């Protein structure tokens, strides 16, 4: 683990200089593409890209997991929906089996925690039956977080062995909006009642013990800020810790990844906070509707690029957003040159 | 012209009731899936669209023609770029010929008026080769205005007949940032400072000229803001007037239309001066990175999906947010139910 964080590649400078001159040579005027240009830079430094904005296989991992913290009436959802929308995946009926096979991207399923008999179809990657209430105490181990990032980083790592080149991740989880929270306040310095939102449809009236649960969860736990695998184990949960694990493992393999909603940001935060060289490889999607998104991408510094007032979770606005990402591509490789139609601008 | 005008199909509230009950027991939270459920539902309400959110055969059509406000120096490019990059646009090398062909759509690619020989495989609907100053005086004649309308009116509608049920609109035409610019000032009300931006980067030392161009050419011609054609025929362009016609042409035929950027915009708020019922079938892509975009958006009441700071043109945000509405109906059509699956949410 400290091996594979000392390992991750920081981005390759040159192919990045040679693909804003190409850039700049197309037909158009300069700088007109805005973000379509700065993101296929942005690819054409990933080491595991090969020196250009390339995409070849896309993949959305899905980190499933239950959290006792349900038990506090965070959550207005059955506990059983987690296992029942897990198997949902398996059949391609969610929105982000939907959305993915728009967009050409293949689901991974993964159960790192869910509170009922293993699902199949779903790869087992368990870590406990859904993790410890975070307001009564961690979520988990600081063992299990470790070794959990390690185990989901190499899956992660395998796939790009079988051509997949890009990411995005996601979650399955009542309640997971909770901790989630936590962590964003923990890491933000904001306060709970700033961060705290709605999740799936949460009701007015029961915001504010969500919100005493958060504060709760951190006095309690004591999580350090400055320590994301800290923050993580106390007050996160199996599936966030997930999250973080592609993200860390896209890193090392030199690949980029889209984030998702909230909780991804949740997870982000962590991941920066565990090995900033992992920065430059995140994509922002969409700007999801909870409460605590704003404040969450500012830590980030992202701006993503759908507004779709998006909060279903599963991965689906990562799913939505790689079309934008196979378009700086095609801009990259398919447009032609100024120069060849003799066109001279300032 | 007052009959097409008239027979504009109102929304089917039916087919959209029906939409929304649907989408509501979709195997997710409700309403979570935010502007992606609107969208749809806006979509169900289409007449042309059978009482479904459908996607069938997709097109760009770009308008192309010079204006004789270029001898202003509102313009860094030099004018016969419009007639290199339409050719261009028959080749497939340009951005939105590269995004289009990259969301499965065909460009359409229209001369209205460009000031040079007619270029084979293009359209021919010249009104004259390039309109005229509008700092001296009218773009062109109100009748002028009228039979370009009606043509592409006509031309897109036909089109419906072949099977596009989604267009997209763009346009092509040195210096036309200024027109738009000027449409804008007039219809919104704002001053010409607020509205004028760098177009194709027009150095911010010219900046100053290119809004006395636009003050000039209001004072000169006294266009009227409750009159549409006679604002459009004053200080717009052959360009401008065309993806207005694309516009009535869609509403007509009762099939929606994806809008750009800041020349869009223009268009799209005399279209809705000239005919409020076209307002429903219009549908925004992206938040252009001109100046006086967001006075345009916020008088159409429209907000953008993406965030690209995009200023290219061509009908390229078009292409790109293309995926979008090709995912509003795919969410309709294969998500899975909460029922099926036995989930009850409150
Ligand atoms: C049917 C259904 C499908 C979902 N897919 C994602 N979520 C989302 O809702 C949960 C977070 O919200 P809270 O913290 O309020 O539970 C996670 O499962 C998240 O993925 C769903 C929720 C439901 C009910
Ligand atoms: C090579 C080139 C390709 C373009 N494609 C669209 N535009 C854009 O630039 C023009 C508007 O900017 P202004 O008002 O400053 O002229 C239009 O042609 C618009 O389509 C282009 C401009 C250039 C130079
Ligand atoms: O932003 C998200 O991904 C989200 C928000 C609320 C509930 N579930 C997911
Ligand atoms: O927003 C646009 O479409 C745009 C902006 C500047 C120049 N050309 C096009």
Same mark, same amino acid.
């Given at each position: 683990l400290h091996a594979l964080l000392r390992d991750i590649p920081a981005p390759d400078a040159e192919a990045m200089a040679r693909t804003q001159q190409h850039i700049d040579g197309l037909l158009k005027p300069p700088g007109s593409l805005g973000r379509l240009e700065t993101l296929a830079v942005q690819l054409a430094g990933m080491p595991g890209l090969n020196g250009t904005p390339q995409v070849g296989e896309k993949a959305v991992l899905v980190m499933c997991a239950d959290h006792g913290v349900w038990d506090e009436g965070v959550a207005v959802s059955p506990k059983i929906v987690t296992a029942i929308q897990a198997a949902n995946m398996t059949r391609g009926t969610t929105g982000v089996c939907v959305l993915a096979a728009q967009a050409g991207a293949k689901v991974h399923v993964i159960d790192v925690? /869910?509170?009922?008999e293993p699902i199949p179809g779903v790869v087992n990657m368990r870590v406990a039956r859904g993790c410890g209430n /975070?307001?009564? &105490? %961690?979520? !988990?181990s600081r063992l299990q977080a470790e070794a959990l990032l390690l185990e989901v980083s190499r899956y992660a790592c395998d796939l790009a062995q079988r051509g997949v080149t890009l990411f995005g991740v996601g979650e399955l989880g009542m309640a997971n909006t909770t901790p989630a929270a936590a962590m964003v306040s923990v890491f933000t310095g904001s306060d709970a009642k700033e961060v705290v939102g709605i999740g799936a449809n949460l009701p007015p009236s029961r915001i504010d013990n969500k919100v005493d649960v958060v504060r709760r969860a951190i006095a309690i736990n004591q %999580?350090? %800020?400055?320590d994301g695998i800290d923050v993580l184990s106390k007050v996160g949960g199996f599936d966030l810790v997930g999250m973080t694990g592609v993200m860390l493992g896209a890193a090392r393999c030199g690949l980029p990844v889209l984030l998702d909603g909230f909780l991804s940001y949740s997870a982000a935060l962590a991941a920066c906070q565990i090995?900033?060289?992992?920065? %430059? @490889?995140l994509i922002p999607s969409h700007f999801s509707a909870e409460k605590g998104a704003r404040i969450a991408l500012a830590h980030l510094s992202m701006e993503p @690029?759908?507004? !779709?007032? !998006?909060?279903? &979770?599963?991965?689906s606005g990562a799913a939505l957003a790689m079309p934008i990402v196979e378009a700086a591509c095609a801009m990259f490789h398919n447009m032609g040159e100024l120069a060849a139609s003799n066109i001279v601008l300032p």
């Open positions: 925690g /869910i509170d009922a /975070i307001a009564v &105490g %961690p979520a !988990m %999580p350090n %800020p400055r090995a900033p060289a992992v920065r %430059p @490889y @690029y759908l507004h !779709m007032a !998006m909060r279903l &979770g599963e991965g």
